[PDB]
Structure 1
């Protein structure tokens, strides 16, 4: 949906005008994402019959194969599992929320789609999982793939 993409791009643009530095933009995007994810989870659980995931591995499958599909129409691949099962990566073929960056670069520190990391954290907090979501690769930063690394911290 262009509607969401365009709205999110306008938001990022406005935040960058509001804040002198991109780290403050990143923080605000994450906050907004967290608040969205808290609400999104109730939408998601009402729309699917995923059962319930009795580990981080089953949760990964639900996120990648069901939730991303539902909301973004895409299926990231899951890779790089830690032997302890508390860490995995979502690999995407581009940046999921942003198509283009402006040249020349004036936002090296900006995590264009940091809102998505907040969404992930907020939605999982509501199912009693303290997690961390973080972009570790981004095609918009010149990487081959986009990679979101997911870590399970604690149960709540």
Structure 2
């Protein structure tokens, strides 16, 4: 029909409401701040609860992304990477992640977050400098979305600019393409 470029600009410019990114950042910052507050600063597995957060969010966001875009079910890692990089983030967060670090035989790749609106302004405490991720919700949302698109992936964070690394990378390695179900009529 049309290129994913044209689709992303068309959907973003004239088919979605808008708000200030500062306020979204503020809300997510409040969530993470209070999770730190009410949990004795157990950064080892506040990330797990944030992962559950992100999974529950993404599993029900996918119904809206497909509602607007109306793409077919992705089958191969190349098309999944292209769609995630090019329109899936462009609709919601208005960013274009870059893709590098292709693994062997096209089973894994990495999302590079050039600009992260979830962390427009944060300076973590000293104890968090090598424990917390602060953006686990994003990869949780990605996994939850791909679950309903019916392809399982282990997704995790390799690096983050917040902790001190040069760039923020999210490995999204596929595990298996689980198949559609059939009635169990004997």
> Which residue of 26, 30, 36 maps to 2:47?
26
Residues of 2 paired with 1:80 and 1:143: CA distance? 16
Alignment correspondent of 2:135: 113
> Which residue of 65, 75, 80 maps to 1:59?
80
User: How far has the Cα of 1:103 moved from its partner?
Assistant: 5.7
Asked if residue 99 in structure 1 is aligned to residue 120 in structure 2, the reply is: yes
Unaligned runs of 5+ in 2: 1-20, 179-186
- Helix, strand or coil at the partner of 1:67: helix
Deviations 1:4-41 (A, max 9, x none): 21110000000001212112210111101000000010
User: How far has the Cα of 1:101 moved from its partner?
Assistant: 3.0
Residues of 2 paired with 1:84 and 1:31: CA distance? 30
Task: Give the structure-1-normalised TM-score.
Answer: 0.93
User: How far has the Cα of 1:104 moved from its partner?
Assistant: 4.5
Whichever of the two has the greater Rg, that structure is 2
Residues of 1 paired with 2:39 and 2:142: CA distance? 24
Stretch deviating more after TM superposition (139-148 or 100-109): 100-109
How many residue pairs match? The answer is 156
Alignment correspondent of 1:126: 148
User: How far has the Cα of 1:111 moved from its partner?
Assistant: 0.8
Asked if residue 143 in structure 1 is aligned to residue 162 in structure 2, the reply is: no
Alignment correspondent of 2:22: 2
Task: Give the structure-2-normalised TM-score.
Answer: 0.79
**8 Å CA contact retained: 2:73, 2:149:** no
User: How far has the Cα of 1:62 moved from its partner?
Assistant: 0.6
Structure with the larger RCO, 1 or 2 (CA within 8 Å, 6+ apart): 1
Residues of 1 paired with 2:170 and 2:23: CA distance? 24
